[PDB]
Ligand binder design. Structure first.
Ligand SMILES: [Cl-]
Lengths: 138, 140, 141
């Protein structure tokens, strides 16, 4: 995590070269995670059909520790959809995105697991309060 | 969801052309979902080995909101196995399937999330009761 | 399960031929499962970037019934990392591994589901206790 996987029958050659970089930047901001650990895995030219039909489609997954809830999921879904519509020429009704909560102690980075506090976004909340105190001095 | 992913070292050119369409129809019926949102993602010619050996194998996943339980999982597993044996020429002892429950509010389709009632199959249970009443002379 | 999935932008031609066999043997021992049902799915030459950058990286998953807990996950992560560094020439800070608990009744092998006692490692724990009692002279007549 965070890992954005895009499974699409749209041909690799036909996808803008900056698509993964743009999706990296967008989801870095949306998930409030360090850019350094944001993966984008583009499986383009996939043998994926939807509704028994080979028109352009996307099944995408977002794997993340914390950050995922009904409100953030819908907002991120619509922005991811918009990028797929614009850059892959895929219709909104051919896009399904799964949001996958990852437990902090069920995910390694760089020789260690993650802090459990991230699952409840306490990393953000505690930094948000500290920054508020710096700007208001209280 | 519903997304059926098939990971197999069986060569793409060896797979019947209608395999994905047939798996779509079968799992549409089995999962009682609209055909329109049924994905089949075939990863054929995959660099997948099983038991350290490159004999034909399948690792498949079924991602679905509701519908998955110990009873439906076993029945769907045996039918998916039968389709892999017949169409991919893979032995039953080289097939593993994972059934993945998806939360309604953790899955988008067409600009919206899904109804939480689907997670508990309330859509099926409520339609089953309504159809029972229609067929057995109960219209009020 | 157990399924080890390796997603790496490292080119297939650059990966030692025995990488999957070595990962199979290592994780068979680590997860205390039959070798027969250990899958290794290598997606090499993947179009996967990390931090907006195309330096060598690995996103791997371990799908397993039982066996996964904070203690086993860290130990397996470091050994998997060591094998990826050696075989894929990737830096530790370009490796993320997700450990995925699989329910026994949500996974088929060879026409049947899995017991359910396996989820809580009761197969290992009950065999460990029975072998301890064998070696320390306890009978069951
Ligand atoms: Cl998952």
């Amino acid at each position: 995590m965070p890992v954005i996987t895009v499974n699409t029958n749209v041909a690799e050659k036909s996808i803008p070269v900056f698509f993964q970089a743009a999706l990296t930047n967008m989801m870095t901001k949306a998930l409030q995670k360090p850019k350094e650990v944001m993966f984008v895995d583009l499986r383009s030219g996939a043998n994926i059909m939807m509704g028994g039909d080979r028109n352009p489609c996307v099944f995408a997954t977002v794997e993340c520790i914390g950050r995922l809830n009904p409100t953030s999921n819908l907002a991120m879904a619509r922005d991811m959809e918009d990028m797929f519509i614009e850059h892959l020429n895929v219709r909104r009704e051919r896009i399904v995105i799964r949001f996958i909560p990852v437990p902090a102690l069920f995910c390694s980075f760089n020789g260690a697991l993650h802090d459990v506090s991230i699952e409840r976004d306490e990393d953000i909340i505690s930094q948000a309060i500290a920054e508020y105190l710096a700007a208001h001095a209280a």
